[PDB]
């Protein structure tokens, strides 16, 4: 198993730029991994988003400097209209992504247990 709870990963979800996030357990399947292999991630930032991500869309987070290669490869690897599916980041989205980056670098400087304490979403 490539990742475990509290791992920081870049996650690619169709329709969004490559986004900092954390491996975490799904609130109602109480699992962080499964075979549909997928992993469950919380996306960092002010929106409390979460998703199941195929491992091929998951890259271990080292830091913001990985963003350019991720973005450029993903549009490089596209089978023309597929390459076009690579759209701009508005000012509002960029600030939301910059927020998520700031959380992810904080999280990366604590331990897995401190960042699990600080960043795990609270559910009903
Ligand atoms: Se990853 C990146 C870097 C710089 C500009 C745009 C992107 C990007 O991937 N944008 C994408 C890709 C797919 C859907 C939407 C969207 O931008 C919102």
Q: What is the CATH number of the domain that holds 74?
A: 2.30.30.140
Domain count within the chain = 1
For residue 71, give the 3-state DSSP assignment: helix
**Residue 92 within any structural domain of the chain:** yes
* For ligand 1, mutation pick of 59, 86, 92, 100 (most atoms within 8 Å of CB): 86
Residue 120 inside a domain? The answer is: no
Residue 116: inside a domain = no
Secondary structure class of 59 (helix, strand, coil): strand
Range of the domain at 59: 8-111
Burial of 112 (0-12, 13-18, 19+ CB in 10 A): middle
Contact between residue 44 and residue 96 where contact means Cβ atoms under 8 Å apart: no
Pocket test for ligand 1, best of 12, 17, 93, 96 (most atoms within 8 A of CB): 17
93 Cα nearest atom in ligand 1: 18
Helix segments in 78-119, DSSP class H: 81-84, 91-109, 112-119
Q: What contacts 24+ positions apart, CB below 8 Å, involve 72-80?
A: 74/12, 74/18
Measured CA to CA in angstroms, residue 99 lies from 20, 22, 92 at distances of 10, 14, 11
Going by alpha carbons, the residue nearest to atom 14 of ligand 1 is: 15
For residue 118, being part of any structural domain is answered with: no
> Measured between alpha carbons, how far is 69 from 94 in angstroms, rounded to an integer?
17
Query: Is residue 103 helix, strand or coil?
Result: helix
Q: Which structural technique was applied?
A: X-ray
Q: Which of helix, strand or coil describes residue 17?
A: coil
């Amino acid at each position: 198993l490539k990742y475990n709870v509290g791992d920081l990963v870049w996650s690619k979800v169709s329709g969004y730029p490559w986004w900092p996030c954390m491996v975490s357990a799904d609130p109602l399947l109480h699992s962080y991994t499964k075979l549909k292999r997928q992993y469950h991630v919380q996306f960092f930032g002010d929106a409390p988003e979460r998703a199941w991500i195929f491992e091929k869309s998951l890259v271990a987070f080292e830091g913001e400097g990985q963003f350019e290669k991720l973005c450029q490869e993903s549009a490089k690897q596209a089978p023309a209209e597929k390459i076009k599916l690579l759209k701009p980041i508005s000012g509002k989205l960029r600030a939301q992504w910059e927020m998520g980056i700031v959380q992810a670098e904080e999280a990366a400087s604590m331990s897995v247990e401190e960042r699990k304490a600080k960043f795990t979403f609270l559910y009903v």
